Every structure is written in structure tokens, then in C-alpha cells.
């Protein structure tokens, strides 16, 4: 009850509940780039590429980011199944593994972010408004709500010779 | 082997086993990446190097000294 029902571990776990959906806001919305030739204004994403002058023509062609963000959405499911099952049956060791997959799901958007930047750099201007700063707020959420959950979930430094990491009780 | 020999309850109990798990997973992703690259991220090739930290799992004087100071800071 001490590492799983403390409030400092549930403020963090509710914070991941924000970043679990903001990284889902990014992975469906295709709004993190603006092609601006000057009409041929196109808005890039992972899955659909839509050119807007209504003449809303959304289609596909980017592959790297898409493939990479199957894993960022893959670790997330795999981390929550560890996290949803670690609040019951008095097991808390499981809380730590869940914190692993949220760092990874954090860092598998950050490849995605870097992968999407190259596409806009090779292809007329660039501007991101709606879903790069979404995912750069779900990167920084999941990457840092994972490392802090990790240090909030371990037994902790003993601070005395008798105390030990991983011991009686 | 370690997992099969600790029903997963005692494996994830040792703070070093968690580090082991972390390293492994990342190292694999690295390989799969290097793969889906050529089938159709200089951060994942850093999971190979982090294995060396395990060595700190046996060294008992280094580990001890380390903890001692990391506990004062
Ligand atoms: C990253 C997630 C957690 C990784 C840390 C895993 C190792 C660890 O936390 O153990 C700390 C260890 C505790 O000291 P202990 O020997 O249990 O104290 C007995 C009292 N004499 O004593 C130590 O602190 C050993 C040195 C730990 C520093 C390792 C740096 C890890 C960062 C990568």
C-alpha cells in the first residue's frame, strides 16, 4: 500500500493518463507541418497527406515515422497492462516494469518527431501548430512521467547501513 | 532463464534485474530498427554500451563506495 497507494505515485500515474491520450491526439491528427508554396498548402502527418486550397483531398504517399509510431503505441498498451494489473492483488514490483514502457513509449515518439522533421526539411516553408507541440508535450510527459514513476516506485535508497534495497517487507 | 527461475515475482524484485530488463528490450528494438531501416536513431545504439553497468553488479567495493556517496548527495 506504500508504493501503490501513496498520492505521489498516483499524481504521476494520472499524469500518464493525460499523455496516453495526447500522444494519441498526435498519432491520428495530421497537422504538424505546413507546406506553404503560394493554392498548394499541404498538412503533413504520419498516415494522411492533405492539400487544401471545398477541395479537401486527403491521401497517403513518412513511412519511418509511421512504422516507429506503431511501437510508441505498442509499448503504451504493454505498459498499461502491467500498470492496470499492479494496483490489485498486492503486487507493486510490477509497477516498476510499467514505468519502463512509458519511457520507451516516450522515446519512440522522439524518434518519430525526428523522423517527421526530415520529411519537411527535404521538401515552400514549414510551420507546426496542432500536433507537433502536442506530441512534444506527450514526449515530455511520457518520458518524464516514466522516469519519475521509476524513482517513485523502487524501494528507495536505504540511507543507513541496516536498510537495504529490496529487503524484508 | 532468470525469469523462469523467479516466477517473475523475484526477478523484478532485484533492482539490478529491472536494469537488465531495460537494457535487453532496448537492445532488441535497436536491432529491429537497424532492420526495418534496410527492409524498406543514434539513441538506440547506446543500449549496447549500457550493458557495462552490469559489471557494477558484482564489484562490491565500487558499488558500496558508490552508494555511500550517492547517499550523501
Ligand atoms: C535506473 C533505474 C534504477 C537503476 C539503479 C539500480 C541499482 C540501484 O538502484 O542500487 C543502488 C545501491 C543500493 O545500495 P545497497 O547496497 O542496497 O545498500 C546497502 C546498505 N549498505 O547502491 C548504488 O547506488 C550503486 C550505484 C548506483 C548508481 C548506478 C547508476 C545507474 C544509472 C544508469
Q: SS3 of A147, please? A: helix
Q: How far is CA A104 from CA A49, A68, A71, A128, B25, in A?
A: 27, 11, 9, 24, 9
CATH number, span A1-169: 1.20.140.150
Rg (alpha carbons) of chain A, rounded to whole number: 20
Count CA atoms closer than 13 A to A128's CA, side-chain side.
19
Those of residues 34-73 in B touching chain A at CB distance below 8 A are: 36-37, 40-41, 43, 67, 70-71
Nearest CA in chain B to A161: B68
Q: What is the resolution of this structure in A?
A: 2.6
Residue with cell 548527495: B73
Taking the C-alpha atoms of residue A121 and residue A45, their distance in angstroms, rounded to an integer, is 14
Cβ separation B12–A100 shorter than 8 A? no
> Are A158 and A165 in contact, with CB atoms under 8 Å apart?
yes
Name the method of structure determination: cryo-EM
Amino acid at each position: 500500500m506504500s508504493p501503490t497507494e501513496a498520492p505521489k505515485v498516483r499524481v504521476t500515474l494520472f499524469c500518464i493518463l493525460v499523455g496516453i491520450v495526447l500522444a494519441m491526439t498526435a498519432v491520428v491528427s495530421d497537422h504538424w507541418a505546413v507546406l506553404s508554396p503560394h493554392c498548394e498548402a499541404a498538412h503533413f502527418g504520419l498516415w494522411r497527406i492533405c492539400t487544401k486550397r471545398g477541395e479537401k483531398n486527403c491521401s497517403y504517399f513518412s513511412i519511418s515515422a509511421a512504422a516507429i509510431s506503431v511501437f510508441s503505441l505498442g509499448f503504451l498498451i504493454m505498459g498499461t497492462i502491467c500498470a492496470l494489473m499492479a494496483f490489485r492483488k498486492k503486487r507493486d514490483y510490477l509497477l516498476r516494469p510499467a514505468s519502463m514502457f512509458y519511457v520507451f513509449a516516450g522515446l519512440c515518439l522522439f524518434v518519430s518527431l525526428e523522423v517527421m522533421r526530415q520529411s519537411v526539411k527535404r521538401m515552400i516553408e514549414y510551420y507546426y501548430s496542432w500536433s507537433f507541440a502536442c506530441a512534444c508535450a506527450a514526449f515530455v510527459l511520457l518520458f518524464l512521467g516514466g522516469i519519475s514513476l521509476l524513482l517513485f516506485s523502487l524501494p528507495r535508497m536505504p540511507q543507513n547501513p541496516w536498510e537495504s534495497c529490496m529487503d524484508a517487507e | 532463464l532468470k525469469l523462469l527461475a523467479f516466477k517473475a515475482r523475484g526477478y523484478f524484485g532485484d533492482p539490478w534485474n529491472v536494469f537488465d530488463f531495460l537494457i535487453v528490450i532496448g537492445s532488441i528494438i535497436d536491432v529491429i530498427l537497424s532492420e526495418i531501416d534496410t527492409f524498406l536513431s543514434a539513441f538506440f545504439r547506446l543500449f549496447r554500451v549500457m550493458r557495462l553497468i552490469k559489471l557494477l553488479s558484482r564489484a562490491e567495493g565500487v558499488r558500496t563506495l558508490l552508494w555511500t556517496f550517492i547517499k550523501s548527495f
